[PDB]
Amino acid sequence: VGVGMENLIISTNEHASSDQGKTVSRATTNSKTDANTVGVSISAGYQNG
Amino acid sequence: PLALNTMDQFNARLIPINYDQLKKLDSGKQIKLETTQVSGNYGTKNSQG
Numbered sequence: 001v002g003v004g005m006e007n008l009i010i011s012t013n014e015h016a017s018s019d020q021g022k023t024v025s026r027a028t029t030n031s032k033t034d035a036n037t038v039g040v041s042i043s044a045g046y047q048n049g
Numbered sequence: 050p051l052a053l054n055t056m057d058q059f060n061a062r063l064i065p066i067n068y069d070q071l072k073k074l075d076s077g078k079q080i081k082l083e084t085t086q087v088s089g090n091y092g093t094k095n096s097q098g
Contacts, residue, residue: 009067
């Protein structure tokens with residue numbers, strides 16, 4: 001009795017995945033600011049004096 | 050007809066196919082069934098009848 005092989009079949013055990021996603025968002029911002037400025041200027045020249 | 054869906058000795062393991070075979074099935078190819086051998090018993094009589 002002998003055994004002969006006629007075909008070899010390979011099944012790869014790899015895992016494949018796919019993902020699909022959607023996002024919607026809304027943001028609201030309120031801002032409040034105050035500023036203070038102090039300035040000093042010195043000028044000197046000759047305009048008819 | 051009866052359902053054949055297991056491949057192990059204790060009817061606890063299903064019959065798997067790989068990705069290429071599934072793609073072939075989804076492409077219109079069909080699976081054929083062949084009978085290789087059949088086991089069975091015959092009846093006799095014992096000393097007790």
